[PDB]
Design a protein around this ligand. Structure first.
Ligand SMILES: O=P(O)(O)OC[C@H]1O[C@H](OP(=O)(O)OP(=O)(O)O)[C@H](O)[C@@H]1O
Ligand SMILES: O=P(O)(O)OC[C@H]1O[C@H](OP(=O)(O)OP(=O)(O)O)[C@H](O)[C@@H]1O
Ligand SMILES: CSc1cccc(C)c1Nc1cc(C)ccc1C(=O)O
Ligand SMILES: CSc1cccc(C)c1Nc1cc(C)ccc1C(=O)O
Ligand SMILES: [Mg+2]
Ligand SMILES: [Mg+2]
Ligand SMILES: [Mg+2]
Ligand SMILES: [Mg+2]
Lengths: 341, 341
């Protein structure tokens, strides 16, 4: 195998042979790839139209190189709540707020996260601002999960060999297939999740990767462009269960949610988004809460997939009570306290 | 303009706006583009399918940055004989031998040329092996042209600012839109040429660039994959004249040429290819001679373009006579002697 062989095949608009995508990604992760080669591969893989098999090979190499958590430290029903980012809408941190609520409802959460790429404050940035430690290693994340009910895996910390690739990506700016890999490479390997995809035409491929792993996942894309379940309009959901994918459209109005305007979900810097978290967890009613409760419920539905309508109802009930009882506010405080010890 | 904008447009499989290819190439030539960006552009432009407008902009930037020849030193009817290479056959240097014959027939030839990419020898390398000085500045190429009847512009010598692009070309290996630019960027700007193209789907694009310039050119592709008029099988000729492009098929056997086997046109190292030049110019008959006579005749038809079958007949006569009189052998000896001075 070689770069001229693989790049040539891609520029011929042909799918790769089995193992070729993995070879390429392994060359990239081990530092044996030139930036020009990394870039050529990223762009070519994107314009050919990647397959689930191919993207799965990429994610697989990353996970084969990632720092794992210790054995028997991640509950079999742990869930992730994370998105690709890149929706260019710059919102409050919906996945992170949902994650907290979900944990507070008693679903174990091992969250994969990262700083912002284009937004003002990403999940990792806002958690930082809240006083939550984002620098924890495998053992401490494992302890966080057991002691608090939530663990945060900071992507750069668990995927050190990915730096070469990430660098090239910033240099070229355009989204590529690599923009899918974040959600697909949680190092704790949870089997369930609510997974945001900003790219409507690649979400199905992402779902395909999760199906192959037999995860219970909702891959979500808001029809307004959000890599979240949105409240401003309908969302597209690729529901992954029993190794199968099926495309659905979801309308929150069916569950009594009023439509919101995108500006109502708008975020700011880390201090502002941190304030927004506290407000929701503090019981503030409004569009931000509604969006949080919806995405939380979605994660719980994914967890249950390990009955659609009853599952959503139960999820909305549980997510709302987790906030109203103070359990979610208390969990964030305990999470902060955990790191300070 | 910006890289995320331009690259985003290409990955969305859209043609660029007027001026965007030029901005990109200008960033590349002025050392303002990172290797990753260069590569991403080359690959993205290739897989979108470049237009004649876009490739003409690339070539135009290169020519706007090139060392020119002194004013009033390039005959208005000068011709080029050159191809893309990248045919992966390692043949004898047909364009270079053809170029000598054409000059010997009294048609001024300013040849754009370069060392080999994958071939064992290459045009510029074979000339060196023959004692010809390839690394001459603008002033001396002009003198060579006036005194000998032929001039060689060494692409690296006249296009220094292309160095960044050439490096990335090497690293990624795969042919890209950049592989079209050599024949399109002769710094002497001849208005006629026999132009070889190894990429059948891109030959029409090259033809359109010459058409926009109102050049008189035959863009040629051997149906055996040769970036020359072949003697193995038929050939596809995009004829360019009066700003219009007419595609047509060409069979050498219609002029008495026996079909040869590509083994017979095979090449070797510089010393080997240099020997083959001396052999053809010395009167040796066989498949190599025939191919040289055919391509030389093609260049002469292109020159005439500044009647199809009659032009080819006169072209074939003039080519054969230029060898048979010894004029081509003599012109090479004088070309060598010119360099030793
Ligand atoms: O800058 P962007 O490209 O727009 O990405 C915004 C954030 O969204 C993603 O994470 P995540 O879903 O976990 O964070 P969230 O809570 O804000 O939704 C990503 O890792 C970023 O942190
Ligand atoms: O290494 P390759 O990619 O296979 O290309 C072989 C040669 O052909 C091209 O020029 P040119 O047509 O002028 O040289 P020629 O005499 O061999 O035809 C190219 O510049 C190379 O020198
Ligand atoms: C230096 S960024 C990085 C570092 C290590 C691993 C990964 C996977 C990423 N990238 C992401 C991680 C997540 C969790 C979300 C998005 C991305 C991305 O860059 O698209
Ligand atoms: C470092 S190679 C180079 C250097 C300067 C200018 C050019 C245009 C090229 N490239 C070519 C020039 C010719 C004449 C033929 C082919 C190529 C090519 O790169 O494929
Ligand atoms: Mg998110
Ligand atoms: Mg988001
Ligand atoms: Mg040639
Ligand atoms: Mg050739």
């Amino acid at each position: 195998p070689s770069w001229p062989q693989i790049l040539g095949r891609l520029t011929d608009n042909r799918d790769l042979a089995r193992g070729q995508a993995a070879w390429a990604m392994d060359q990239i992760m081990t530092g044996n790839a030139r930036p020009a080669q990394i870039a050529a591969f990223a762009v070519a893989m994107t314009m050919k139209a990647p397959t689930a098999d191919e993207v799965g090979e990429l994610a697989g190499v990353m996970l084969s190189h990632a720092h794992p958590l210790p054995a028997d430290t991640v509950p079999d029903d742990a869930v992730d709540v994370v998105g690709t980012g890149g929706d260019g809408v710059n919102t409050v941190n919906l996945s992170t707020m949902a994650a907290i609520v979900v944990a507070a409802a008693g679903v174990p959460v091992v969250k994969h996260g990262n700083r912002a790429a284009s937004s003002l404050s990403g999940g990792a940035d806002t958690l930082e601002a809240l006083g939550v430690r984002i620098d924890l290693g495998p053992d401490l994340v494992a302890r966080s999960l057991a002691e608090v009910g939530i663990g945060f895996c900071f992507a750069p910390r668990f995927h050190p060999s990915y730096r070469h690739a990430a660098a090239v990506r910033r240099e070229i700016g355009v989204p590529t297939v690599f923009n899918l890999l974040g959600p697909l490479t949680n190092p704790a390997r949870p089997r369930a999740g609510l997974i945001g995809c900003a790219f409507a035409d690649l979400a199905e491929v992402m779902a395909g990767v999760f199906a192959a792993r037999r995860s219970s996942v909702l891959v979500v894309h808001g029809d307004d462009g959000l890599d979240e379940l949105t409240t401003t309009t309908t969302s597209t959901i690729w529901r992954v269960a029993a190794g199968s994918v099926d495309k659905l459209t979801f309308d929150p109005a069916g569950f009594g949610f009023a439509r919101a305007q995108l500006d109502q979900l708008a975020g700011g810097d880390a201090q502002a988004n941190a304030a927004a978290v506290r407000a929701v967890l503090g019981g503030a009613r409004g569009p931000v809460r509604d969006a949080v409760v919806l995405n939380a419920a979605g994660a719980i539905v994914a967890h249950a997939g390990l009955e659609w309508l009853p599952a959503w109802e139960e999820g909305l009930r549980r997510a709302s009570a987790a906030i109203d009882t103070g359990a979610a506010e208390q969990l964030l405080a305990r999470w902060v306290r955990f790191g300070r010890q």
